[PDB]
């Protein structure tokens, strides 16, 4: 299928693109395309953020209107199906380089040299405790801003990424 959405970019100068327009995003014959818009409410004075295409997503299924369902968040977001369905939108809540030490690199003084970053982490397992350090490239760091690999869960495992030389050592 083929889908044309309204495209808008607020950070269009730094990113060097058109401020507003309409784009056509070719899709996959196996999945479906959507349109999306994002804006800040802030006391009735609406400021645009980003409009455009939005690949398949289970939440935008069967929605001809772009209505933010979130319960009063900072940045409002909505999506919809069909050509140009992001032309309008409203808010209606729902009622429902560097070098480090990698613990499996003893071949070279337990070291590395990735362009991305390096991590260290562990938890209580195999009885007592463990220890893990490693380094991963820039590509594997996804998303760009906040690589998940650098995130943890409060309840057990901790995690930390870092960029400086040899920062992934001991807790």
């Amino acid at each position, epitope marked *: 299928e083929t889908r044309e959405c309204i495209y808008y970019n607020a950070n269009w100068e730094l990113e060097r693109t058109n401020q507003s327009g309409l784009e056509r995003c070719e899709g996959e014959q196996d999945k479906r395309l959507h349109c999306y818009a994002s804006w800040r409410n802030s006391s009735g*004075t*609406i400021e645009l953020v980003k409009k455009g295409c939005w690949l398949d997503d289970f939440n935008c299924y069967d929605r001809q209107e772009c209505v933010a369902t979130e319960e009063n968040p900072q940045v409002y977001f909505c999506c919809c199906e*069909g050509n*140009f*369905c992001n*032309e309008r*939108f409203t808010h209606l809540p729902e009622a429902g380089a560097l070098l480090c030490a990698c613990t499996s690199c003893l071949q070279a003084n337990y070291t590395c040299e990735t362009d991305g970053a390096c991590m260290v982490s562990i938890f209580n397992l195999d009885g007592m405790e463990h220890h893990v350090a490693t380094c991963i490239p820039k590509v594997e760091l996804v998303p760009a801003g906040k690589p998940f690999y650098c995130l943890s869960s409060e309840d057990l495992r901790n995690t930390h990424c870092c960029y400086t030389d040899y920062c992934n050592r001991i807790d």
Partner: antibody, heavy 119, light 115 residues
Framework: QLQLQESGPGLVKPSETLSLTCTVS??????????WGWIRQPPGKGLEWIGS???????YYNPSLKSRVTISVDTSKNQFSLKLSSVTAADTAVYYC???????????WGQGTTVTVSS | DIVMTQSPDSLAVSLGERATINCKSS????????????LAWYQQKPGQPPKLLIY???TRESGVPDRFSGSGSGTDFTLTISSLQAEDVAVYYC??????????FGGGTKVEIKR
């Protein structure tokens, strides 16, 4: 729900510029549409699309009356302005402020404003 | 710029009888991407702004009764009011609003009732 209000001078001297402002209610201009539109209806004739404009500023004057029309927006005042130079008695008409859509065509309209050109 | 030509000018049919109007376009209104026609049918009663009846050639708008139906394709479209009523007396306009910039209107076809 959305309401399109419009307002103008009502009377205009011959061979002078004309202006019309279109306030909006129950819906932010940057929201609830991509295009906005000015249409007019001569006294007892049909309709004629004057122009449209996206809330980002780009305009599309009708090729019939292009180079005399000027159309703009103001998202800080939730407004929407039309201007028409060198008027003749043919320009006398009822001007409608509507919202042009790319799925439903012009769906919502205003209450119209009558503009006469007479000395 | 997709010239619009409605037909006829006047139309007089009795209460509860069928009314049909036809508008022709000089350029095709069909869109290849999504297989759709960007045409609109509007109603205007005296002193009131026009009211959109049909969009996408044959899709009806919320709150519009069933007696109104749109049909056609390419450069020929039709609008039928089955069983005319006295409230449906008005002028009717055929418009095109495809992505191309110049959006043009028809000539205006009035509907009259026989009594």
């Amino acid at each position: 729900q959305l309401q399109l209000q419009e307002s103008g001078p009502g009377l205009v001297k011959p061979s002078e510029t004309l202006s019309l402002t279109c306030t909006v209610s129950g819906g932010s201009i940057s929201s609830s549409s991509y295009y906005w539109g000015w249409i007019r209806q001569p006294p007892g004739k049909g309709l004629e699309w004057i122009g449209s404009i996206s809330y980002s500023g780009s305009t599309y004057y009708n090729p019939s009356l292009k180079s005399r029309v000027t159309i703009s927006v103001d998202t800080s005042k939730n407004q929407f302005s039309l201007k028409l130079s060198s008027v003749t008695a043919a320009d006398t008409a009822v001007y409608y402020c509507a919202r042009d859509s790319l799925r439903y065509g012009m769906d919502v309209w205003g209450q119209g404003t009558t503009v006469t050109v007479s000395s | 710029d997709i010239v619009m030509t409605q037909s006829p000018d006047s139309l007089a049919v009795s209460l509860g009888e069928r009314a049909t109007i036809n508008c022709k376009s000089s350029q095709s209104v069909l869109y290849s991407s999504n297989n759709k026609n960007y045409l609109a049918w509007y109603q205007q009663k005296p002193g009131q702004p026009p009211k959109l009846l049909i969009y996408w050639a044959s899709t009806r708008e919320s709150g519009v009764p069933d007696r109104f139906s749109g049909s056609g394709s390419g450069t020929d479209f039709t609008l039928t009011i089955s069983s005319l009523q006295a409230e449906d007396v008005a002028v009717y306009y055929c418009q095109q609003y495809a992505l191309a910039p110049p959006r043009t209107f028809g000539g205006g076809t009035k509907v009259e009732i026989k009594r």
